[PDB]
Design a protein around this ligand. Sequence first.
Ligand SMILES: O=C(O)c1cc(NCc2cccc([N+](=O)[O-])c2)cc(C(=O)O)c1
Ligand SMILES: O=C(O)c1cc(NCc2cccc([N+](=O)[O-])c2)cc(C(=O)O)c1
Ligand SMILES: O=C(O)c1cc(NCc2cccc([N+](=O)[O-])c2)cc(C(=O)O)c1
Ligand SMILES: O=C(O)c1cc(NCc2cccc([N+](=O)[O-])c2)cc(C(=O)O)c1
Ligand SMILES: O=C(O)c1cc(NCc2cccc([N+](=O)[O-])c2)cc(C(=O)O)c1
Ligand SMILES: O=C(O)c1cc(NCc2cccc([N+](=O)[O-])c2)cc(C(=O)O)c1
Ligand SMILES: O=C(O)c1cc(NCc2cccc([N+](=O)[O-])c2)cc(C(=O)O)c1
Ligand SMILES: O=C(O)c1cc(NCc2cccc([N+](=O)[O-])c2)cc(C(=O)O)c1
Ligand SMILES: O=C(O)c1cc(NCc2cccc([N+](=O)[O-])c2)cc(C(=O)O)c1
Ligand SMILES: O=C(O)c1cc(NCc2cccc([N+](=O)[O-])c2)cc(C(=O)O)c1
Lengths: 141, 138, 141, 136, 141, 137, 141, 141, 136, 141, 138, 141
Amino acid sequence: LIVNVINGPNLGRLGRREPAVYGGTTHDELVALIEREAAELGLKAVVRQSDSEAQLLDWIHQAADAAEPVILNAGGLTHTSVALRDACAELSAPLIEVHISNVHAREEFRRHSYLSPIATGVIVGLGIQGYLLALRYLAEH
Amino acid sequence: LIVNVINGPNLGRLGRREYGGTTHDELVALIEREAAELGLKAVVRQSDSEAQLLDWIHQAADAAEPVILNAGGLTHTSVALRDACAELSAPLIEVHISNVHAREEFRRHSYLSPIATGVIVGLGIQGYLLALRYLAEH
Amino acid sequence: LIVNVINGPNLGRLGRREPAVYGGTTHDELVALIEREAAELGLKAVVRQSDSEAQLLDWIHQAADAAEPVILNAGGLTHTSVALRDACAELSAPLIEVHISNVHAREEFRRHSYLSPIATGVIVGLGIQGYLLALRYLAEH
Amino acid sequence: LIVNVINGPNLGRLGRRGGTTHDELVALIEREAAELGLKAVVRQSDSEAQLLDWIHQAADAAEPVILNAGGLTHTSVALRDACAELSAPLIEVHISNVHAREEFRRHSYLSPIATGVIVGLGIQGYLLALRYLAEH
Amino acid sequence: LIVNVINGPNLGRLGRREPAVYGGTTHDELVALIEREAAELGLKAVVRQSDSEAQLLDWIHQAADAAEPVILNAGGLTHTSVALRDACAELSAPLIEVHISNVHAREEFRRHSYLSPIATGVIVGLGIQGYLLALRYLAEH
Amino acid sequence: LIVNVINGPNLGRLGRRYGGTTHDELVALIEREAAELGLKAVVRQSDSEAQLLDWIHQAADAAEPVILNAGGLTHTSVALRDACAELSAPLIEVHISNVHAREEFRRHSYLSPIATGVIVGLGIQGYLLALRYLAEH
Amino acid sequence: LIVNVINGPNLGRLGRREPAVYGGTTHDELVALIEREAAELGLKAVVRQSDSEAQLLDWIHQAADAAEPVILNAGGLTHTSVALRDACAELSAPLIEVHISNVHAREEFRRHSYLSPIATGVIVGLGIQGYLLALRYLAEH
Amino acid sequence: LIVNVINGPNLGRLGRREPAVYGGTTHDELVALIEREAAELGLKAVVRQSDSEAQLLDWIHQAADAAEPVILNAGGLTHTSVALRDACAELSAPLIEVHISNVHAREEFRRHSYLSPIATGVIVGLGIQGYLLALRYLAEH
Amino acid sequence: LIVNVINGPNLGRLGRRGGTTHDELVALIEREAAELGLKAVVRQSDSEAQLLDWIHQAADAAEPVILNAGGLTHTSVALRDACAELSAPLIEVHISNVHAREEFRRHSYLSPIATGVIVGLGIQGYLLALRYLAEH
Amino acid sequence: LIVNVINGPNLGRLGRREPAVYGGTTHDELVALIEREAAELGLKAVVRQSDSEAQLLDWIHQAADAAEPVILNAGGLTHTSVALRDACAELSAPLIEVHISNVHAREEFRRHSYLSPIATGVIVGLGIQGYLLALRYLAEH
Amino acid sequence: LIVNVINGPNLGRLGRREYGGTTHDELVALIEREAAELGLKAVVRQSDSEAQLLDWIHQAADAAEPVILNAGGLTHTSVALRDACAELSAPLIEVHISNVHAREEFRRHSYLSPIATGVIVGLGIQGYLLALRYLAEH
Amino acid sequence: LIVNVINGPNLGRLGRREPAVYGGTTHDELVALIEREAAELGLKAVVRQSDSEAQLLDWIHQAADAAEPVILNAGGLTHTSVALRDACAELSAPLIEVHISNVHAREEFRRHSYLSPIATGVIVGLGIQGYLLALRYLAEH
Ligand SMILES: O=C(O)c1cc(NCc2cccc([N+](=O)[O-])c2)cc(C(=O)O)c1
Ligand SMILES: O=C(O)c1cc(NCc2cccc([N+](=O)[O-])c2)cc(C(=O)O)c1
Ligand SMILES: O=C(O)c1cc(NCc2cccc([N+](=O)[O-])c2)cc(C(=O)O)c1
Ligand SMILES: O=C(O)c1cc(NCc2cccc([N+](=O)[O-])c2)cc(C(=O)O)c1
Ligand SMILES: O=C(O)c1cc(NCc2cccc([N+](=O)[O-])c2)cc(C(=O)O)c1
Ligand SMILES: O=C(O)c1cc(NCc2cccc([N+](=O)[O-])c2)cc(C(=O)O)c1
Ligand SMILES: O=C(O)c1cc(NCc2cccc([N+](=O)[O-])c2)cc(C(=O)O)c1
Ligand SMILES: O=C(O)c1cc(NCc2cccc([N+](=O)[O-])c2)cc(C(=O)O)c1
Ligand SMILES: O=C(O)c1cc(NCc2cccc([N+](=O)[O-])c2)cc(C(=O)O)c1
Ligand SMILES: O=C(O)c1cc(NCc2cccc([N+](=O)[O-])c2)cc(C(=O)O)c1
């Protein structure tokens, strides 16, 4: 089973920026770390990142079409794109929203999510380890 | 390293009446075994009483011990619980079995989330094990 | 047929005082007034009062295991206790919420109820006799 | 003592998508009324104007009112006003549990100036309203 | 110049109630007072009351058709009817909203009028005298 | 295959200050189209909530569809909504003007959540297009 | 009987420009008309204007101590000043709020008044004549 | 006469995803169906779809300079995009906002729109036929 | 001549991560109240039901109350109703300035029914409130 | 050590209207009491009152320059004057807000204060003693 | 060519700030020199008195003189100000020294902004100099 | 010394329609004035426009990485885009927001900006000159 991990706006600048907020692991490094861990779990992971909403929707259609699960961290889109939420609503396989930071201890507007109500589950504020714990849930279903 | 798992009211009624599946005494064994398997000691206690929860959260404060907590309904009502928890130096992880952001609008706000290290929602009984794992690393 | 009447915080000092917004009847004379009406319609009503939210929950628990119906007047907790709502959600058997005073005349915080949406029905502002009226609903189903 | 039972718009439709038509409820009420020594005058209208005149008449004659106003329960100040004048008890009644439903059904204009409220106890709620009046 | 005085629902009950609100004058006397003042001011006045919205809507249509000013006290309808407002918005002549009591000192729900924004002017809380001040406004324009 | 077209408060006043064209021209226009489509259309207009509620009850009992333009009652009357909810056949809300370009209070509608669909701002043809949707159900 | 007419900030600017929002009558001409009208009514009108809040407080204080009625158009202070409210609260004689323009046909902030809920009545939109009308209310006490 | 029919994010999935509403007609077919209807009415219907907000913006820019009509189903963007609204306001030919499903009967955030207050009119909940319906309006006016 | 000083949830934790412990607090309050002609009973509980019992006893005994209900200030309708019953003065004290804090701390169920409130003046609040009671 | 007791609008009229609510103590009796109290404690109280916002500003500016502590009862301006807050935030010394009446048992608009969030503390509802209690806090720091 | 620079409450206190480091006296001299460098005359006044502010605004209205106004807190609280300012027929520029959008919620609404020609915020005392430069060109 | 001037969606069509709300000067003419002016200050301006949020985020990343200041008119995204705010938050050099029109004289949705609270400052309503007055600030530091 393939499992898509999809990262949204600004997330390709992970590690080089905001290390005190998002940890020091880079995104090139995130991919490898997650690839390694899906393998160990008997899963295969496609980890991708984009600053373009249109790209994100395309990858979401692709997963919806393959019946593939999806670990999504939309960055700021989470609280703004109806378009995104509509795309993830097609997903037969489970959907796990992840955010490295604790969205709830942060600005007011980061506390409302157009995606949370249609997701299997959500993990927030557990750093980069939030992706791996998401794989783990999927590997068990 | 001792890890505190705390379950708020009505959580003694787990399993009985439908999600999963698992009962409370069962959940105790899953977590307890998983924890040791990770090299951790876990006490798991449930309570229908705010004062009992506050007491456990005080004892864990004094003891600098990490806390994992499904406070339940009190998540959305209790300022006392929130202030009890703010004292914690060790990580605190909020766990909810169901996906609360897909429920009534009043479970969509949590007094605990903004003072918590992290939050895990909608992943079932597995949530606890995942919190246990995060703690094993930090 | 075993009907449960539960009374939450502050109702213990009924009659006693204040007696003008709730009326003359004591808590003990309430038990007895119900206990008799319980007979007059053929059921065996259990009446209990506690200021402790936890006792109440324990009692709602029992009634759920027993599949026994519930008449509930949970003082102020009505408006602030999700856990009390949650425990009441479990009732196979009917739940009648009763408030002695017309809570819709009183302060605004008193005009929303967490219990109201998961209850079979609500009786409000018919005084002490409202408990009795709801005993009669249970007789008829 | 003549208790008035007034029923609002759409309530003549009773029994359609309790198969109790309006006409049947009038008989279940009138029985219980006298099975308690009271005269119950049960009426229905789709006209706000009409209901307002009915409440006028009860106002002018110190008679108790049991009111299920339907929609107008949430919309009508003119109805709130008229029911304010009732010196005798007013008991607002609704067959379904309005709190289990849409948010707009959760506010009532009537509830605050009413003596008491019965909700979602089906049709026996009208009857219970009477038993209360039975005690005055 | 014919001027229209229209009164909404419950306004036939002037005399009752409260005598505290409201005041002493019955609808009849008010009707008689208005006609007296209107002649005295050199205008003909037609005072009608109804508890019926459609009835009030027709009285307004005719005033639109005839280019007659209206002095309007709609009772509750002030705060609830788009129909009435829509209808009054067709009046080419002046429209003066009048209320007997001080609606800004009463229930929050009375502090909003659908008519106020499309009226020429508004007089409130000045009792029965209000109609006669409205009258005077109309006579000078 | 009958379609009820019901207009609400004020729409009697059409053509004398929606668009031009009178109410009488409207009924005429709606019939010719309904016939052009193998439908019979009964177009009535009241100012009374009572009169409307009643027509809705009749369409309910007869399982006829309704094109409704309730005027201001769209935004005020829960009564009108409950009667409309009874309908088993389609219900199509229509407005002549664009209710979303006007005052705020006109931008929420008690009917829309329980209607099949809504047509706003396309003037009088708004009714015509609605019948045509009913033609293909 | 002494009657006090008090105009708040900007109302010294009356007549000049001249707005079609307010009349072409200057604030001087307004004084003349009121005192004149009051004389015809057998009242004695003192008409004063200020841009200073504190000065309006002093005049209200002075009206309170002499138990004289007040016709008030506080301009915009209506909407912002609690201090004016508290000072007007202590009047025993009537207080009639007057605005030249219809303030419900205007912007949102002009549609709440700190004063309305404590005034005897309010006249809004009838132009300069509103002051004369309020005089008539007062002449008839 | 050229009419532009513009479909927003996720409308490429038309037919493949949840059919209760939006139906079982794919996007390809709709273009055929729209194209045929235009022939019948003596119109040329250009039908296009993009997940790219910038691609939509460009198409709407073009429709403006050409003064061509626009039928627009912007999907989610309806509720989240100001850029879209602004470009649309900029059109001089009519703009019919079309939505396949009854937006007003779903989640509250689908109940407010950016485009509607600047649209000629709006069609909702009439399925794929809305688009045919909007064409008819355009054919006559 | 008795004053009740009742302390809510978490306040048993004082001086531990403010400085002054709860045992110091009682010490301070008792002496100062003695210095004023009063006798002060200073109780503290994390349990809502116990606070109710302490407020009940005081309503019965017509003794004044000083109350730092902790978080219970913003959640407990029960507690408030219990305090509504008090006939002698009810003074609300918070050690910190609850208005410079989170939004939910800027609203109290209690304040609207207390004689008055003292906020943000640390431990001296209690003593200050004892001094309002000496004078009445 | 000098303490600034500043009283806002209407407070000059203490001891006159509204003996219930504000007490029987006059402002002159207040200025005296506070002065005697200061002596007993080792402080020198400077008590001033004004209905003028510009004046209170002046006074707070002066306290700021002298790094003197301020006890302020701002009257209405508590709820309205951002300019007041601004001047107060400049104080190095403690700032204790005082209200004679329990503002939290009165109109909602008094329930919220611009100053409270930047005050050392607030004492409300204890009548005139509240000024002496504030003094006494400043005597210990 | 006369330009009115009007400073509202608390602005007499610049330099004993918390808001730059320059004083009101000094700012008066900055502005005057720049205005003259720009072919203009700037009258710079500050008052803590709303009534005073209205007067100057009345005068500049009657003179059809443009206005640079930094109204302090009154920006958020005075309709009387809004009203006085609406009368001006020459441009009105609202200036603030500090970024108001980055502070309290109450600072994010203005009675003036809606009827100002334009607004300049966050750019320090320099905001006054640029405002002048716009009036210099139009 | 590089200064990035970056313009959002729709800004390409500057000059063309409008010339009322923001207009007259085309985007090219704009690029020329800014350049002519940036030089006279001893700066170099890079002026780019785009309809694409991704592209906009890309240019902010570049400025962010280069430590160059940014004058940004994001247009609509001012109000809608978290990701752009997060991208802007990483800049270490001043960020200045500019809008040609006065955004506070317009619709309510335009009266809130995600970037103002993280910008150095904002210039609004001075049209094109805003940009030139923004360079001028940068030249001073
Ligand atoms: O807006 C949000 O809720 C949000 C946005 C983002 N944006 C992505 C981002 C923002 C700033 C900087 C980076 N980065 O990785 O350099 C990445 C992340 C997160 C999170 O993972 O917790 C949450
Ligand atoms: O309101 C909540 O946030 C909440 C409350 C609760 N309450 C405990 C509870 C309520 C109903 C039923 C059970 N149960 O386990 O049978 C347990 C649980 C959960 C959860 O982890 O899904 C979330
Ligand atoms: O929060 C409520 O709506 C509520 C609270 C209460 N509180 C219980 C209570 C409070 C104060 C005093 C008494 N009592 O028994 O004198 C009882 C009662 C009722 C009622 O039955 O109408 C309703
Ligand atoms: O809701 C209102 O704004 C309103 C309603 C009404 N309703 C008419 C009314 C209601 C109850 C009783 C009577 N009456 O005359 O006994 C009359 C009047 C007035 C008024 O003239 O101040 C204002
Ligand atoms: O409040 C509304 O949404 C509303 C009210 C109405 N009211 C009907 C109406 C009011 C005033 C005048 C007329 N007329 O035809 O002269 C008709 C119509 C429409 C519409 O179809 O756009 C919408
Ligand atoms: O804010 C208000 O409600 C308000 C303000 C004012 N402001 C006083 C004012 C503003 C602009 C111009 C003038 N004037 O007379 O030159 C006077 C007047 C009126 C009114 O009398 O209708 C209402
Ligand atoms: O609900 C509140 O705003 C509140 C809560 C509390 N909670 C009591 C508390 C919580 C955590 C720690 C302690 N403590 O022992 O220092 C005390 C205190 C205060 C106060 O006195 O300012 C105010
Ligand atoms: O608006 C307020 O919160 C407010 C206003 C005021 N206004 C002062 C005031 C109003 C009416 C009468 C008097 N007085 O001194 O006779 C004084 C006082 C108080 C208080 O000390 O509790 C509180
Ligand atoms: O309320 C505002 O938006 C506001 C208030 C003020 N108040 C003036 C002020 C308040 C406190 C302290 C000072 N000062 O001179 O140190 C000045 C200034 C400014 C500004 O120029 O950016 C903005
Ligand atoms: O919503 C805004 O804050 C906003 C949006 C926009 N949208 C950009 C835009 C919209 C329509 C037309 C054009 N144009 O240049 O033709 C440009 C501009 C401006 C401004 O520069 O004042 C401000």
